[PDB]
Structures are given as structure tokens and as C-alpha cells.
């Protein structure tokens with residue numbers, strides 16, 4: 001999981 | 009023929025999306041770590057690219073249909089294409105007379121030599137400027153420029169994408185709009201669509217070279233430390 005890409 | 013309503017609405021939405029995410033004043037650039045001329049330009053260019061990734065994300069969100077994909081496909085598309093969208097959208101600040109990107113001041117004028125002070129070599133930068141020159145000479149209308157960014161972003165041939173059919177159908181719908189626009193609205197663009205598709209293949213090759221060189225850069229703690237959290241996530245191998 002991507003912390004920042006979770007602003008998709 | 010004549011462009012249709014749905015085609016019109018797509019062009020309008022893409023041009024508005026670009027105007028909302030690309031600020032011709034470049035006034036935000038004073039907020040980056042300042043440029044300095046061992047990798048004296050990496051802090052400033054890491055900030056510039058990180059900022060630009062956020063803009064490309066805002067642009068993607070306003071591409072008609074993109075927001076209907078799963079979050080996983082959106083991120084896969086963004087991660088694989090981000091550096092390409094940045095290379096394309098940067099053509100707007102690129103100048104033939106200076107052979108550099110000029111962004112509202114001498115401090116924010118970037119030439120090939122500045123990017124070597126960020127870890128990159130002529131293996132990437134020489135092809136990159138030739139790309140900017142050839143793209144600049146195409147004299148794209150704004151409509152064409154923004155369509156090409158959306159087409160590049162909505163490519164289904166990317167690693168990590170699941171719904172390949174839905175993404176290809178979206179991209180096909182944008183290619184059709186672009187083809188109709190060029191035929192109807194662009195005098196002398198008989199060969200233009202093919203030239204733009206070719207630029208997409210140039211971008212693939214520049215992506216590969218950037219990724220190779222980014223890896224060499226990002227595996228050294230003294231250099232990865234100067235990047236931003238968003239750059240590390242977007243350009244990283246984390247799945």
C-alpha cells in the first residue's frame with residue numbers, strides 16, 4: 001500500500 | 009465533418025483541467041528549496057518534480073472517466089506515466105531560443121547543465137532536449153497538447169494495470185477526439201497524429217532511461233534523503 005497516494 | 013457535442017465537452021474539460029493545474033506565473037516556485045549552481049541542484053529539482061506530480065494528479069482527476077477506474081488502476085497509471093506527463097507538460101516552459109526551461113526568472117531557468125547537478129547524465133538529458141525541440145516544433149494547439157497528456161496517462165500498456173479493456177476504451181475515445189480535432193481544426197496536420205503517437209514512443213524510451221538513472225540515485229542514502237516523500241513513493245518500486 002502507498003501511504004500518500006491513497007490523497008487517488 | 010464537424011466535431012460532436014461529447015467530443016466538444018471532452019476537449020473543454022481537458023483544457024480546463026490543464027488551466028486549473030498549470031500556473032503560468034510559476035510563483036509557487038519560490039517555495040521550493042532554492043537552486044544551487046555534489047548534486048547541488050537535487051533539492052530544488054526534487055521539489056519541482058514533487059510539486060509537478062501533485063499537479064499531474066489534479067489533472068488526472070479531471071480526465072473524463074479516469075476517476076471511475078479503481079483506485080489501484082489510477083495509481084498504477086499515475087506511477088508508470090508521471091515522469092512522462094512531466095516531460096510533456098514541461099514543453100510549455102521550454103524555449104527554442106535558450107534551449108532550456110524558463111520559469112519566470114533567471115533563478116528558475118533550467119538548462120542541461122543544471123540537471124547533471126541533480127544526478128543525471130547526457131544519456132538521458134541529450135535525448136530529453138531533442139524531444140523538447142521536436143515537440144516544440146510540432147506547434148501543438150493547446151487542445152492537442154492536453155489531449156496528448158490525457159492519452160499518455162490513459163495508456164493500458166503499463167505494468168500493474170488490471171482493467172486493461174476499460175482503460176483502452178477510454179484511451180481510444182481520446183485518440184478519436186484528437187484525430188477528429190486534427191483533421192477538422194488544424195490546417196496541414198495530415199501527418200500530425202502520427203507524429204504525436206511517435207512522441208509517445210519517445211516518452212517510453214525517456215521513461216526507461218530516467219528510471220535506470222533514478223534507481224542509481226535513490227539507492228544512495230545521501231541522495232534519497234534529499235528527495236521528497238511523494239517522489240519516493242511515485243518513483244519507488246513499492247507495490
Ligand SMILES: C=C1/C(=C\C=C2/CCC[C@]3(C)[C@@H]([C@H](C)CCCC(C)(C)O)CC[C@@H]23)C[C@@H](O)C[C@@H]1O
Nearest residue numbers: 056057060094095097098101109118123126128222
Ligand atoms: C517540472 C516541470 C518543468 C520543467 C521540467 C524539467 C526541467 C528540469 C529538469 C527535468 C525536471 C527532468 C528531470 C531529469 C527529472 C528528474 C527528477 C529526479 C531528480 C527525481 O530524478 C524531467 C523534466 C525536466 C517546469 C514547468 O514546465 C512545470 C513542469 O511540470
